[PDB]
Design a protein around this ligand. Sequence first.
Ligand SMILES: CC(C)S[C@@H]1O[C@H](CO)[C@H](O)[C@H](O)[C@H]1O
Ligand SMILES: CC(C)S[C@@H]1O[C@H](CO)[C@H](O)[C@H](O)[C@H]1O
Ligand SMILES: [Mg+2]
Ligand SMILES: [Mg+2]
Ligand SMILES: [Mg+2]
Ligand code: NA
Ligand code: NA
Ligand code: NA
Ligand code: NA
Ligand code: NA
Lengths: 1015, 211, 174
Amino acid sequence: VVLQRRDWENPGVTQLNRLAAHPPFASWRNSEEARTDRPSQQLRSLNGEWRFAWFPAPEAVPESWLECDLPEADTVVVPSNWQMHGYDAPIYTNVTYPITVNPPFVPTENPTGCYSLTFNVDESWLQEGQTRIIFDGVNSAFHLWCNGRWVGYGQDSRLPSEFDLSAFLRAGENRLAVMVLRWSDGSYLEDQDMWRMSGIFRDVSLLHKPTTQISDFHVATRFNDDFSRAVLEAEVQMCGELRDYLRVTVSLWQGETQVASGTAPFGGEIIDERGGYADRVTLRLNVENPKLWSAEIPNLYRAVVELHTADGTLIEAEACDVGFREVRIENGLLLLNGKPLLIRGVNRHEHHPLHGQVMDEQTMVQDILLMKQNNFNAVRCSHYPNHPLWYTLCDRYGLYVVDEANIETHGMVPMNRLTDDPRWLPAMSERVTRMVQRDRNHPSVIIWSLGDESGHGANHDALYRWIKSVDPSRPVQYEGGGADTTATDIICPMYARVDEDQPFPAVPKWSIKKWLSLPGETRPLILCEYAHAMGNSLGGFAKYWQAFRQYPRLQGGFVWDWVDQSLIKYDENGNPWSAYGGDFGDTPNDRQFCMNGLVFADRTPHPALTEAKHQQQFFQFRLSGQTIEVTSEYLFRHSDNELLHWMVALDGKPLASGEVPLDVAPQGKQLIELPELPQPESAGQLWLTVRVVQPNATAWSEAGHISAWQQWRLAENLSVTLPAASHAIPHLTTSEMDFCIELGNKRWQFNRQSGFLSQMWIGDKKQLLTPLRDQFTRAPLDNDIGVSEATRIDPNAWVERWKAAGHYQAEAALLQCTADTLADAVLITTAHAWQHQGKTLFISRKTYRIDGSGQMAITVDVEVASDTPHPARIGLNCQLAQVAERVNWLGLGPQENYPDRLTAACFDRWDLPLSDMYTPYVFPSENGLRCGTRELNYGPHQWRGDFQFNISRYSQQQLMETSHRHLLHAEEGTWLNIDGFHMGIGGDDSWSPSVSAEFQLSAGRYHYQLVWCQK
Amino acid sequence: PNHPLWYTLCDRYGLYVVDEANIETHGMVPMNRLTDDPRWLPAMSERVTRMVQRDRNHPSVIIWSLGDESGHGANHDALYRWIKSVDPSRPVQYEGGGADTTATDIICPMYARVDEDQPFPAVPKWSIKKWLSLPGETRPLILCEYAHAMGNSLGGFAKYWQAFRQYPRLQGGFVWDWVDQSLIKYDENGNPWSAYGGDFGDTPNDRQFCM
Amino acid sequence: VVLQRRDWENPGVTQLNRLAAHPPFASWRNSEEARTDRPSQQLRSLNGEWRFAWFPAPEAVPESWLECDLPEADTVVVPSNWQMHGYDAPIYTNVTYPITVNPPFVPTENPTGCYSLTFNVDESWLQEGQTRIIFDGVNSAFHLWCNGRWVGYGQDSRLPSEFDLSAFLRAGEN
Ligand SMILES: CC(C)S[C@@H]1O[C@H](CO)[C@H](O)[C@H](O)[C@H]1O
Ligand SMILES: CC(C)S[C@@H]1O[C@H](CO)[C@H](O)[C@H](O)[C@H]1O
Ligand SMILES: [Mg+2]
Ligand SMILES: [Mg+2]
Ligand SMILES: [Mg+2]
Ligand code: NA
Ligand code: NA
Ligand code: NA
Ligand code: NA
Ligand code: NA
């Protein structure tokens, strides 16, 4: 009947013989074990070495497999995705379905994974009670056999599927056979923007329950107006024979102290004309002055639910962590424990570069520590229920969670084709209902989400109301169909900009500030997705946070996203490298769009992470005279693990410093008076830097952790002293092809045909490998490119506008190149025009003044045609002959920063190895810029002025021609790009131009000056 | 849902119709055991949605009903909202779980009395006059069933109509019911007679309660 | 598959291969006929004399019935309730379920009505278009075969169940 019914092509069949969903069970038979959350003898892991065989279609699986192991099969670790073992290719596609859109049908060629296990079952498990098997995650559908006999079927890749094996098992040795289909009717609701994989990728376990058992339990906490009193309400359901002697005790523990306890027989209150639930009981416990749960202080109690006889014989105990907190929306504000939240959120997919979509405790803990260390307090489970341990860790470490149903139909046309179709309501309903049934007792879950990018259909409205009816304790959100539909309590747009409207027909993305005040609108706004962190991105991040802080009903958002979905591949030499879409032969694919993270797949931070940390700081600062004002944005805690370090420096030279403990009440202010600082010995700018340091280690951070910082300019003393007049005069030598200038052991050469400095000598060693030339382009960022491809041009993308205008191929044409000998200097004057097919794009006019001190002063004046697309940069570049170890600069750093992403950077004296001056984005682009730089040092060279720079072994050309970082080769010498001006990087999204007007180079005329010397 | 011709005739002759989904779980303990169970939501959804899909163009249909005597469960709320979303042109009513739940636009009790309260726990049947003015209550009241016309009955019928006429928000009701459910049997002489519960050897049965 | 799956004891299966519900259709090929609500040549009644046999359970139904009329069957009027023809007793109960309350299961003794019809289909219906069968009311669940081949399954006694027969029908007798 199995191959004949084809249940994986029927949205009316999502399971067969599957047990009801429920909160995490362990069936403890000792109450103390339940309290302490120790392992349970009744819950066994079936994880480890299994048997696996791959087949092209279910029709190709031999019947012998049901009863006997296939000799050709391999021994593989489970949980796993079989693409990660190389059995077939993972596919990266974004919107377009990885299969033909023909609901409910999938392809006849349907990769089929045949898993099997031979394992022991102890006799005690079969004499009495119930033995069930739990598959936490199977992608995407499966049939189950036990000892050759058919058990059942399950769909939904992201929630547990449980089956009763009581009648199927024998004492001693048993064999499970699992046939896992890659594609099913379930796949139509699983079109998330991620790698498409398959297999048994979450834990497998056996659970023993007594016949008379706790089958469900719900925990609720309600409060008085000031949260000084709480009632814990626990509804408990049983299965088995009802008996007068049966009791439930719910006890609440704070550590080893029992705080409250309730005991009752079964039999609920009257519900309707037919009575009540005889198989249910509700316990109500009073808690005075409850310690409240939040992301700031994740206070937890332990609830123990004991099923027992009147006389005190335990039948079984279940348990959970309890966080006392109230989530509600009032007067248009999302409140936690009566206070308005500011969501410092991030979207997080379950991704490992080696193990695919299999999650482990270590990786989960790594992510949480990094999140909190970078001032995140919230996470969205994009876009499916997570591995059950995730919620446990969010409960205990303290993160707000949006729990999201595994429903995404992005690739449908229109997007709501299935979600507005009542035929798909049953499949949809199970993805929502079984999520709520599983996760409703986790305090970390504060908001339910109906899924992602599935338009808005009537099925959403029905399921929205279902959740509101079953769980009034949490708001329900959903972005589909324009982010403010009748199926959402929160306006939750994706990539809506701060000030700029994007008025798409039917689904406009209004300016978030404007959206709040639309006629009739009263809801809070929290972006489900914003600041698309794809490659060199997060430009304009500060603009969001300024708006979040100014507007009460702008309550933050979730960054897209946490971790690059790159996968490890190996080259001919067995060296690992990071791969994206298309690198596995997968086609169609969406290339590097799988990498949008604040961190690399191995959890190394992108530069953007520090900008997020700084903007999401919990302390705000103002300076007035000698007074620093510190304001706390904590809602609940006092600053009892914080001290303020202050430092004053003159152009990087430390002048004074000190510490002051912070004592700020939540949302309070502290004034700190700086001591009178002695005036500087010399000329320059004084800078004040403050840092908030955490003296003590926490559960989530080490001692000395810096949580916040800020900088101000103090007094500036402008240099008025003239440099000592030298007695030497540079000597000009002229040929037909060159102007040469000599001073001591120094020599400069200007090519009279090109009009550029072609060479410089110190002693008689060449300093340049490539002449010093103007540069108006950059190796395009992911944001510059957008969705543009060679086969499908998007003429609107910045890269295509520059290409079509001829920016990348425009050649310098010399207009003027003269030399004059002065009193104590040689003056070279040049003029160039960059042209494309008769059109002059840019004009550059320069003077180079070389004096008797050996300093070369370069003055640059650029004109940009008003009708050419604004250029990516206005600067100079050259390839230096020198390769030096260190890069030393006075400017913004230490990390990579761009004009619209530099708030996190501090002005100071920085010194890094050359390799740190390059950011290894997996898709190579312009990278490693540092802005606001007044002095740059590299080997013998020093440049002074007010510029942006990057410096590395890779030319802009190589960066733009190479599609993977592992294929980059260090070039001879060092490429230096020194810009007077550089365009913003953008990132509000990565599929339309997102660089704000104020960060585009539109001024028409530009001026900058540089001094080049040897030190 | 009725035979399709019924709606054609109500359209043409002129009767207001309440179209009711084929869902009644009266015998469950408690009455909402299935309708509050998410696993029965798919079966229930089809009985509601396929009714609306079939009958939504009939002018005679003025109100949708979610079924009858199935308590009040979360499945009712889900389906209430589905209809409200798909067809804003008709109010949705449903009596289960106390006749004034979040799954009904109309207070629609059965056998609520005019002046006399019947304060059953959980699901009281208030005096219809008193029900209207309960704190916070603003909805119209139309009994889905009243005046149980079993045998020699309809005593006090005039008391309903006096109240309907006096109170604007008391907008009437549906008598229970139109036609005796008796079946013809034949005796030894071949003579026809009217039969009720039990007369076909059917047991357990509810005797003359079908009339 | 039919007896093995027991679709009538699974609330997750309420139909198989059933077409989407819709308002009353007649597929007129003339606008004036549609306007006047006059009969449509494309909508045919199958009401009348059918073949019928009663069984105490679906397990008691012989395989031969799928492809050949059972000689012991009677000719009865359809639409009908088979209790009104005297094949078993009608049951009057108010609140208490007529069956043991044990969801999703029903009694193993489950009265089964086997209906059949031999009919002709107009030639032009086989060459082009779509031919569907509509059952306006079947109490309480049913499987459908056409010319020995299984078509689908349906529940809900009070709404139409419709099935595409286009791939099942033949020239002449069906
Ligand atoms: C490219 C847009 C049309 S869709 C856009 O794609 C992004 C790519 O990372 C993300 O998946 C977003 O969730 C989605 O809105
Ligand atoms: C007998 C009551 C407890 S239930 C009562 O039974 C009546 C009998 O005609 C009707 O069926 C009503 O709808 C029902 O409420
Ligand atoms: Mg299916
Ligand atoms: Mg998507
Ligand atoms: Mg069924
Ligand atoms: Na705000
Ligand atoms: Na992506
Ligand atoms: Na590149
Ligand atoms: Na009235
Ligand atoms: Na009756």
